[PDB]
Amino acid sequence: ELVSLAKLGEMRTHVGMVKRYWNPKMGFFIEPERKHNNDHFVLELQRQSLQTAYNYVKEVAQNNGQILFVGTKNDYVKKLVNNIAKRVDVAFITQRWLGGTLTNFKTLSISINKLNKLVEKQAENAADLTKKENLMLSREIERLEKFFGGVKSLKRLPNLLIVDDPVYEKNAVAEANILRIPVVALCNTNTNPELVDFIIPANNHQPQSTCLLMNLLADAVAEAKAMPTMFAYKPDEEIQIEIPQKKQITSQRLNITRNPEVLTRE
Amino acid sequence: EFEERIVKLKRISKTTKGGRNMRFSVLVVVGNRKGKIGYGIAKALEVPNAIKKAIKAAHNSLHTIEIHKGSIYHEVIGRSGASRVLLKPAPQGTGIIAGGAIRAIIELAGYSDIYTKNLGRNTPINMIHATMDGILKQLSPRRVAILRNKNLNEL
Amino acid sequence: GQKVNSNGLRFGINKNWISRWTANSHAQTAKWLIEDEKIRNLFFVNYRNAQVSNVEIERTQATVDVFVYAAQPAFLIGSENKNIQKITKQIKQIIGRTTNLDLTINEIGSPMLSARIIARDLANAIEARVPLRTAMRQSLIKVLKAGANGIKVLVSGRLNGAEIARDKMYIEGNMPLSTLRADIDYALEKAQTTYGVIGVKVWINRGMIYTKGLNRTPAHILHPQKKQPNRQ
RNA sequence: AUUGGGCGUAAAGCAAGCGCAGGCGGAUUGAAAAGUCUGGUGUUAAAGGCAGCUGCUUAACAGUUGUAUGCAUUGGAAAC
RNA sequence: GGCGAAGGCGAAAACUUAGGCCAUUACUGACGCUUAGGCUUGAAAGUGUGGGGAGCAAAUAGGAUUAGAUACCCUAGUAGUCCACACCGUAAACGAUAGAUACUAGCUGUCGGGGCGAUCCCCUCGGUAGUGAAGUUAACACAUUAAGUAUCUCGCCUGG
RNA sequence: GGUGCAUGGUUGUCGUCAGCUCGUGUCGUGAGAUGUUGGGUUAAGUCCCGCAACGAGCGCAACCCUUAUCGUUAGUUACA
RNA sequence: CUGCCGAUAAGGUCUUCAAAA
Ligand SMILES: [Mg+2]
Ligand SMILES: [Mg+2]
Ligand SMILES: [Mg+2]
Ligand SMILES: [Mg+2]
Ligand SMILES: [Mg+2]
Ligand SMILES: [Mg+2]
Ligand SMILES: [Mg+2]
Ligand SMILES: [Mg+2]
Ligand SMILES: [Mg+2]
Ligand SMILES: [Mg+2]
Ligand SMILES: [Mg+2]
Ligand SMILES: [Mg+2]
Ligand SMILES: [Mg+2]
Ligand SMILES: [Mg+2]
Ligand SMILES: [Mg+2]
Ligand SMILES: [Mg+2]
Ligand SMILES: [Mg+2]
Ligand SMILES: [Mg+2]
Ligand SMILES: [Mg+2]
Ligand SMILES: [Mg+2]
């Protein structure tokens, strides 16, 4: 099968956020509450939702669709998406999601075309570049690469979106919804289920659960593309992953003191 | 053959540090006279550019319309702000007894016989909003069959 | 605010002089200066259906040389060189029989991207009761298709016979007016309408001159051939 | 604005309370039948109203046949 | 933050006295909601009679400021502000939101009763606040204490 | 000769101040908002970051002239 | 760190238009 239920439990993919932070519309995936203070999930629903999303992304990638991965959250997730990009040639946006990356694709298409033309000009080289002008063009290459280095490949609107957090990527999910493009996401108890299509009940704060699930969707794409899998359809010894540095791991949401009353009074 | 007809051409203006920036706003209704109709409002410094942008916006948002015997199936009240537009089924022959913005929408949608009365405001955008809202809330006599488990409208 | 004449700001740096002569004395510097204006005005006022873009004058102690560029030189040439003799007599009366003339028509290339004939065509359209919005747009689109940079057209006057004067501009692209290295060609014309006078100003951008020099090189006459004759 | 409107900021919630008459009002059973529904009969003058036809050269018009609304009485229905 | 229907209520004590919340294996058995007319209460100013008068201060006098100052500032200063008994019955008397009844996500506080028993904290039943989606609105905004989905009753509105 | 309150053309002024807008997109029933506002740096909307905005045009800056050092060409009518 | 500080005759333009290229 795809994964093992014990493995999900040991990776902490059945633990959401503090009960104070939850959208009441997400009650279907959170089994009746109890003394847990991080809102646990139904493991059967997790596997069922994951399998459905796996099947769909595989169908798209087999039929030569273009999927775009968008994670602009914690640093770890950024490096994760870059690693997934290395494994599979999927377009990615690790930096901030530009307004209208999909709905006003023409202007960003002009920008990425300019990036490619500048890249080949620099590669073709000339002694006219000298020192000052060469540095200016190189610095321009760096900026359009930092913000378009993963979008350069595609030439047409993607056929699918994978979002790490629908709450943080509200702009990305809104663009996908207005253009009627499938979007999958790892909801974490604080998301509106209406916006997402293939919901995948999961965590989003643990640097282990995220990586396991993110690689799993990447694993579907790699099998459809005919390159060997990484985490899917795999035994215990090869799924093992480590907890990043910098008793048990603490998925508690705190830092509430950084939310005072909006400045008022007179 | 998506025909288009201006329903209003207002003259909006803002104030700057000396003078008045004046821009024309157009309200175009586009319809194929077969079941597809949309509306688009745009602003520009000149009427031609405003019309082009309004038609582009109107063609971007096209809704689907169903007709029954050329008319509207059941009487409906479309609400949008303070504008309330009443639509009523009509026998084949009366023609479109509508007038103004509502009349333009009904003709561009395809409907023939239709009874209308504007019970609220006379602002073209809200009347069109109300008309489209009334037509979009309509229930076919086949959707309720799947819902109520009847016999494809049969008594 | 007020702007310095675009042509006049670029004279003696990147643009040559339309008249190149050195007179003998301060009395002969005035005669030789009004006379060439008459010749240029003659070419421009009448003989307009030819699209004359620029007329240059070259004079020595006593020998007058005229270089006339046009888009349609058939009207100047006439039927088997008829109208041509007429204009020669015109030129001779203005300067004098005692001198030697060497008039030279020279057909022009890339007629579109020239602010003179565009202004003349604009002025003709306004005088012909053509709607102003449509007239500028057709001229703008044809000029851009000709393969040039941005064009700026300002048409101020008693617009459409109105009693309150207005002004309509239409820039479409980079028109760097503050830049000296740019090649901006400027011309102004007076459309004589039944309700008054219409002023049309055309700014055209024809690239960047990256070769230093007070021109001495043609400008938008090179692309196609440029010859014909009537000289000696 | 019964059908067919409103009362925070546009006209309009009495300063608040105790409150008779009036209006409205929990659930179940029985009877009566005042409301309610329905059948029969009488009547609601004629002209006009709407439909058809005739006659004026067609019409306007005239005539012609059809065409309701309510009330009373009597015989049933029992859900509110 | 608490109480009262509203106006209002804050040194301490005694007497008299009103309503309210929670749990009820008890009792009566629709006796309930609203309310034209009627009655009761109703901030401050004001009135009538008799006391009281420390402070303050309408009216008034003077000194300033000012083109002028019958005003803002300052020094004086009567009625009044206080008590008892009689009236007046008006306020931005405002939550600018009549009362009653049933239903409709959630989160954070705080107060009272009850359950457990160091507090703290958990649950239940209510009062008082903030944030907030469906829903409503012309918009601001309201949003389980509705301006939401509905019913009953009363009062009121119809351009300046 | 009249009408600069019918105009063309030219000019003063804010002001050589750093501004004024447009295309596409998004929000708002709408006028409209966004970009152009936040944080740093400048003479500057100059630039860099942030950012439902992404870009572009005019202005700003540089390219033009002149003064300040030196090299090269030339040496009279300069110098000598 | 609270000086002082009052007034401004009447009526008026300006958007012509998208039919369209
Ligand atoms: Mg100002
Ligand atoms: Mg009303
Ligand atoms: Mg009021
Ligand atoms: Mg009240
Ligand atoms: Mg009141
Ligand atoms: Mg009571
Ligand atoms: Mg009673
Ligand atoms: Mg009768
Ligand atoms: Mg008759
Ligand atoms: Mg008092
Ligand atoms: Mg006095
Ligand atoms: Mg005193
Ligand atoms: Mg007194
Ligand atoms: Mg009152
Ligand atoms: Mg609120
Ligand atoms: Mg009146
Ligand atoms: Mg003037
Ligand atoms: Mg911003
Ligand atoms: Mg910015
Ligand atoms: Mg003073």
UniProtKB/Swiss-Prot annotation, chain A:
Keywords: Ribonucleoprotein, Ribosomal protein. InterPro entries: Ribosomal_uS2, Ribosomal_uS2_bac/mit/plastid, Ribosomal_uS2_CS, Ribosomal_uS2_flav_dom_sf. GO terms for biological process: translation. GO terms for molecular function: structural constituent of ribosome. GO terms for cellular component: cytosolic small ribosomal subunit. Pfam families: Ribosomal_S2 (PF00318). CDD domains: RPS2. NCBIfam families: rpsB_bact. Belongs to the universal ribosomal protein uS2 family. This is Small ribosomal subunit protein uS2.
Swiss-Prot record, chain B:
It comes from the Bacteria. GO terms for molecular function: rRNA binding; structural constituent of ribosome. Residues 2-65 form the S5 DRBM domain. One of its GO terms (biological process) is translation. GO terms for cellular component: small ribosomal subunit. Transmembrane segments: none annotated. Keywords: Ribonucleoprotein, Ribosomal protein, RNA-binding, rRNA-binding. The N-terminal domain interacts with the head of the 30S subunit; the C-terminal domain interacts with the body and contacts protein S4. The interaction surface between S4 and S5 is involved in control of translational fidelity. With S4 and S12 plays an important role in translational accuracy. Part of the 30S ribosomal subunit. Contacts proteins S4 and S8. Belongs to the universal ribosomal protein uS5 family. This is Small ribosomal subunit protein uS5. The gene is rpsE. The chain holds residues 65 to 219 of 219 of the full protein.
UniProtKB/Swiss-Prot annotation, chain C:
It comes from the Bacteria. One of its GO terms (cellular component) is cytosolic small ribosomal subunit. Residues 39-109 form the KH type-2 domain. One of its GO terms (molecular function) is structural constituent of ribosome. The keyword RNA-binding applies. Keywords: Ribonucleoprotein, Ribosomal protein, RNA-binding, rRNA-binding. The keyword Ribosomal protein applies. Disulfide bonds: none annotated. Transmembrane segments: none annotated. One of its GO terms (biological process) is translation. Belongs to the universal ribosomal protein uS3 family. Binds the lower part of the 30S subunit head. Binds mRNA in the 70S ribosome, positioning it for translation. Part of the 30S ribosomal subunit. Forms a tight complex with proteins S10 and S14. This is Small ribosomal subunit protein uS3. It comes from Mycoplasma pneumoniae (strain ATCC 29342 / M129 / Subtype 1). The gene is rpsC.
